[PDB]
Amino acid sequence: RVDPLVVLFLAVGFIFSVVALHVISKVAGKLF
Amino acid sequence: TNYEYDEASETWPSFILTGLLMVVGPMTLLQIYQFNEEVFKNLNEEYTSDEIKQFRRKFNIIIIVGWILVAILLQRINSNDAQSTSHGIALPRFLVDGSASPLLVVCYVALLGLILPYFVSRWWARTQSYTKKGIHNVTASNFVSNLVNYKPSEIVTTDLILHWLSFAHEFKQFFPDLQPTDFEKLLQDHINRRDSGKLNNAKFRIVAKCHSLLHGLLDIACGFRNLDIALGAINTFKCIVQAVPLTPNCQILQLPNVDKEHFITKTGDIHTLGKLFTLEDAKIGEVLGIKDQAKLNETLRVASHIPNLKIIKADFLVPGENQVTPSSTPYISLKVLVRSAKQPLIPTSLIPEENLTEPQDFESQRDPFAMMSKQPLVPYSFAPFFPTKRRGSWCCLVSSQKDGKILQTPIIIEKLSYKNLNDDKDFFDKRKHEKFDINDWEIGTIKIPLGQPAPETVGDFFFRVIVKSTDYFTTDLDITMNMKVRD
Amino acid sequence: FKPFESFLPEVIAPERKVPYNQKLIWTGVSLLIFLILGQIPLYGIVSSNRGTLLELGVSPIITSSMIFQFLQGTQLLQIRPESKQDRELFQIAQKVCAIILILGQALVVVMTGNYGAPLPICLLLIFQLMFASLIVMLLDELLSKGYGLGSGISLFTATNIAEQIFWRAFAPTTVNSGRGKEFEGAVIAFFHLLAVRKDKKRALVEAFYRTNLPNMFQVLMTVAIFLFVLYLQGFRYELPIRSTKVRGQIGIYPIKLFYTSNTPIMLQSALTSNIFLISQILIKTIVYITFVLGSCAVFSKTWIEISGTSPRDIAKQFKDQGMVINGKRETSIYRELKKIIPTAAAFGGATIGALSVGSDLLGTLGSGASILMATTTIYGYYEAAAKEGGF
Amino acid sequence: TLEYNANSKLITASDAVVALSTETNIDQINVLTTSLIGETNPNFTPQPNEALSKMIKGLFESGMKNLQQKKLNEALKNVSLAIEMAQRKRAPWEAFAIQLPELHFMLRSKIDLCLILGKHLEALQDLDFLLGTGLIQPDVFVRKADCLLKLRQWEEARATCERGLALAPEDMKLRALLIETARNLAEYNG
Amino acid sequence: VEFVREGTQFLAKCKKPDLKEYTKIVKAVGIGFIAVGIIGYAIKLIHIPIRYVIV
Amino acid sequence: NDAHDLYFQIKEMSENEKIHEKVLKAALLNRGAESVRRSLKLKELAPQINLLYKNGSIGEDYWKRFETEVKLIELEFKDTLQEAERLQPGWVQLFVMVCKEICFNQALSRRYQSILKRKEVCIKEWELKINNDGR
């Protein structure tokens, strides 16, 4: 029932969280 | 990190060089690549307004840039002099790990994660907001309601329809300042050619969009089966075009220059371009009251070049076969002519009819409308008081007599030919057969489908079909016909 | 359970006819999601679509689809082509079995890959892969639901192969040995040599005769065969049909050369794969060329009707549609079709075989199979656009 | 809003800018309450007063006698009073079997008598109204076309005589009207 | 001996496209194809260093 | 386009100001009549509007509004029935009969009055200048 806009929004939110967590763990290892 | 990133700075630039030279190439080659007879494009400035000019006009090098970059980088790399495997990339390492690396990464993530979603969301919202014909959903809604709750008790009037067109929500977007309560009066003062307040620019944009607005409403009211409504819409469209209120003599008020009140008082019987041409050249201008050779010539020319129609062999067809049959899909055919109240009453006999009846080239015999779509468009109109330069336009629409209600989408036709009007053939007058090009008169073919198919029963069922000329109070055409199911 | 209860995330249907522009834009964004997901590293990896966030790719939906295709070619579940609940349960089972695959092969890869639990972070990663595949699934749901163009999976395949071509042709990867740096981007090294060295004619013809990696000659042959096969598209044997039930209804039935749509190459490839691989695990030029000739001949003349479009098949279908041949005899259809169908079929097969072997001989930058697959995909897209009216 | 009469027990709202549905419902509930008090019976019946109907019919016979005097104006007056008093004095649930039959009885006598009396604009209006009601009949179309041409306008007459022609081209009166409008439009142009 | 001759006598009756139509079809399809291709190409390219740095 | 609010007005007025029970009876007839009339018109229009929707000049939003409007007028008509039966025991049976009866009569009277506006418009545009005598 989800609208396509909502599809995109949730997908990009997911991948954004993913890459943020990647680089922020890179930081949590290097500078933290 | 199985990859190198060429901090040596003598590897990449050739990359971006070619990766963009192949982009610029096609632009270069594509740039270095380097039917009808219009009448009024040269003229209409004779009767425009300066403010209209101002408004209509007030509302390829990156190739060379890239080529300069080509030169720069070529000279640069040339000035530069210069088991074993390697995973070499182009970009200089400093972009990889340098202090600009957080910059690059946050730039990229901003770019996708926001530029994209925001942009596509805005785009999709603004698209989905419209309809499939350029009209905005709220306006559509309002017209549909306005019509359905409209008790047909009242009778349409140009004032009523304009009152409906007060609620252009797209207008209200672009002019958040004022009220449709005013927009009505603005329209009215406009349609009377009289000046508005400070809002000349406003009313200009108004009529500009009013064109498409009116087309949309014509559509939906028609699909809603109120002929009177549709016919009124078309009348009012001619009205907005020629900036005149609907009047039973406006057939002559669509002229460029008329003594309005004087001529009204002096003569009122004359409502036909024919009656105009009927009298004498000196005499017609005498009646008009302009007394100028130039103005009279302009008016005679323009009135000579406003179209008119006349039925010739209006009937039905069915592709492949030749006989109407129960539960079939016919289509209207009528190969008509264009006149200007100067070449009347040409006998149907006086065409061999060989040049008229359709050929049978099979695929064409299956795909109609190709032969007509071959023809050119319609030239520009003349409307002084409309802002832009606009082609003509024809509307054809259908009417069953069992109810009088329209029975399909109304059909626009704007592929035509007016060459039967040029002064080259002016020799034929109203004041018979002497050196005439019998086979230079085109025969404007009109072929109009019928959405709802034929009936299942058998009989001589009757229709009425009408072609109304937009932009012109000229001799529009209104006919009946019928169809005999045979089986 | 032939019916079931709907506690799944389903996609909204296209409320109305959606126009060309928006359809295309949807394809654009959907492909973009596909690509970005295809080029993103994961979280749990320390060692060397390979190894990507979508290493598995679209295998779950691929299976579910072809699984049900085979099972209904056997006609196991006795599907009734009358209701809407039929297709409903159809796709329902598709997605549910898909989900089970997701979970299963997920925990599989967890154990198999030498990652090692050291421990809940592995659960987090398995969640990530699950959700990625689920995204791709519902994405193709919207695409082939009507907003897209149809078979977003064939679309994706067309991408991967075309993308692969351009990457091999233009990519900025270089190795160095003996003669300095050499980029594997064909045009890259081409213009590089063009710039840095003298003896202009010698350098041109020498990179031309690049005995080792893709040539200017190579890419030129690629674009050549490309526009040529595209030209071969079209070539449609029309035929005039005339309705009999609803009179006046005329039409043209076209018979495109690739009536089978490249399936012969899939089949011959499958067979050679079964043969040579298992053989070596557990001039002949004329031989192999005439072999591909015969293989496409037979695979056409069978796939024709094991698909379900035979002369007799299409003839009974025409009786269902009440459609005579215009200009000829009523029951003469079946004879004329028996004439036309298998001829054009085997000929399309021979042609595609010739194209494939010419590709492999010229060593052009990509698999002829992939080439024709993508070209037919986007060509069908065009044909939709045209038969309807496109901007 | 209301500033109403409780003496005669008649409702009314304010006297200012007012929308249509307002006055509609006002007059409706008014005549409904007058109906209830003229009934004085909680159980009504969709049957009307045959006595009142017979008084109306006697008024109509008096109008026919007034025509018998070869006096047309007073006849028009009497039968117009008949129209009005019948439009008023019958409930919105009386005999459907007589309402529109007698309606068209009246209206046809009206249109013919007024046509011969001379006035024709109101005649045209009666014809447009009855057409809306849906009494497509050759005689109806004869009257409408006569009236339209007598009012000197051509396109709409062509259209309406066409719509009439879609049912019975076999007569000759309408075809004569068609030759009339044909020469008339030919002269209009020329 | 017979198959190819008869089948080509057939094939000459399949109304291939012609110059203008071919230009149309290329201008549409090949352009769409180059489009999708370059999309994937550039995106994977620019993702290379992203892949490096995100880690 | 509503008067249901007007009947709420009259009922909450009758709550304290007592004109006559028959006045509220009559207004109840009026509201029920408009209810059944809008029901009839929407019912007959359903295919035409659905067709306009399919052809797609309307969007989606108005279609949503129309389906909900149908649901509303349905349930509100049922509520009119329940309120009528609460009011009186035997005024639902012949009630909807005379409801459609009054419906047709009021449409008749509406159009019968419309002739005034009609002739005003016609004389205004055509400037015929009718005489007190036949002209």
UniProtKB/Swiss-Prot annotation, chain A:
It is found in: Endoplasmic reticulum membrane. It comes from the Eukaryota. The chain crosses the membrane at residues 4-24. Belongs to the SEC61-beta family. Part of the Sec61 complex, which is the major component of a channel-forming translocon complex that mediates protein translocation across the endoplasmic reticulum (ER). The functional states of the translocon complex include co- and post-translational ER import, cotranslational membrane protein integration and retrograde transport of misfolded proteins out of the ER. In the cotranslational pathway, ribosomes synthesizing presecretory proteins are targeted to the translocon by the cytosolic signal recognition particle (SRP) and its ER-localized receptor. Component of the heterotrimeric Sec61 complex, which is composed of SSH1, SBH1 and SSS1. Presumably three to four Sec61 heterotrimers assemble into an oligomeric ring with a central aqueous pore. In cotranslational ER import, the pore diameter varies from 9-15 A in a ribosome-free resting state to 40-60 A in a functional state when associated with the ribosome. The Sec61 complex is part of a channel-forming translocon complex whose composition seem to change dependent upon different functional states. This is Protein transport protein SBH1.
Swiss-Prot record, chain C:
SUPFAM superfamilies: Preprotein translocase SecY subunit. Its main location: endoplasmic reticulum. GO terms for molecular function: peptide transmembrane transporter activity; protein transmembrane transporter activity; protein-transporting ATPase activity; ribosome binding; signal sequence binding. Gene3D superfamilies: SecY subunit domain. The chain crosses the membrane at residues 24-46, 52-71, 96-117, 119-139, 185-196, 213-232, 263-282, 285-304, 340-357, 361-382. Keywords: Endoplasmic reticulum, Membrane, Protein transport, Translocation, Transmembrane, Transmembrane helix, Transport. Residues 1-23, 72-95, 140-184, 233-262, 305-339 are cytoplasmic. GO terms for cellular component: endoplasmic reticulum; rough endoplasmic reticulum membrane; Sec61 translocon complex; translocon complex. It is found in: Endoplasmic reticulum membrane. Part of the Sec61 complex, which is the major component of a channel-forming translocon complex that mediates protein translocation across the endoplasmic reticulum (ER). The functional states of the translocon complex include co- and post-translational ER import, cotranslational membrane protein integration and retrograde transport of misfolded proteins out of the ER. In the cotranslational pathway, ribosomes synthesizing presecretory proteins are targeted to the translocon by the cytosolic signal recognition particle (SRP) and its ER-localized receptor. This is Protein transport protein SEC61. The gene is SEC61.
Swiss-Prot record, chain E:
It is found in: Endoplasmic reticulum membrane. Belongs to the SecE/SEC61-gamma family. The gene is SSS1. One of its GO terms (molecular function) is structural molecule activity. It comes from Saccharomyces cerevisiae (strain ATCC 204508 / S288c) (Baker's yeast). The keyword Cytoplasm does not apply. Component of the heterotrimeric Sec61 complex, which is composed of SSH1, SBH1 and SSS1. Presumably three to four Sec61 heterotrimers assemble into an oligomeric ring with a central aqueous pore. In cotranslational ER import, the pore diameter varies from 9-15 A in a ribosome-free resting state to 40-60 A in a functional state when associated with the ribosome. The Sec61 complex is part of a channel-forming translocon complex whose composition seem to change dependent upon different functional states. GO terms for cellular component: endoplasmic reticulum; endoplasmic reticulum membrane; nuclear inner membrane; rough endoplasmic reticulum membrane; Sec61 translocon complex; Ssh1 translocon complex; translocon complex. The keyword Endoplasmic reticulum applies. Keywords: Endoplasmic reticulum, Membrane, Protein transport, Translocation, Transmembrane, Transmembrane helix, Transport. It is a single-pass membrane protein. One of its GO terms (biological process) is post-translational protein targeting to membrane, translocation. Residues 51-55 are extracellular. This is Protein transport protein SSS1. The chain crosses the membrane at residues 22-50. It comes from the Eukaryota. The lineage of its organism: Eukaryota, Fungi, Dikarya, Ascomycota, Saccharomycotina.
UniProtKB/Swiss-Prot annotation, chain F:
Residues 1-135 are cytoplasmic. It is a single-pass type II membrane protein. It comes from the Eukaryota. One of its GO terms (cellular component) is rough endoplasmic reticulum membrane. Keywords: Endoplasmic reticulum, Glycoprotein, Membrane, Protein transport, Signal-anchor, Transmembrane, Transmembrane helix, Transport. Present with 7820 molecules/cell in log phase SD medium. Signal peptide: none annotated. To S.pombe SpBC409.21. Component of the heterotetrameric Sec62/63complex composed of SEC62, SEC63, SEC66 and SEC72. The Sec62/63 complex associates with the Sec61 complex to form the Sec complex. Part of a complex consisting of KAR2, SEC63, SEC66 and SEC72. This is Translocation protein SEC66. Acts as a component of the Sec62/63 complex which is involved in SRP-independent post-translational translocation across the endoplasmic reticulum (ER) and functions together with the Sec61 complex and KAR2 in a channel-forming translocon complex. A cycle of assembly and disassembly of Sec62/63 complex from SEC61 may govern the activity of the translocon. SEC66 is required to attach or retain SEC72 in the SEC63 complex. It is essential for growth at elevated temperatures. GO terms for biological process: filamentous growth; post-translational protein targeting to membrane, translocation. It is found in: Endoplasmic reticulum membrane. The gene is SEC66.
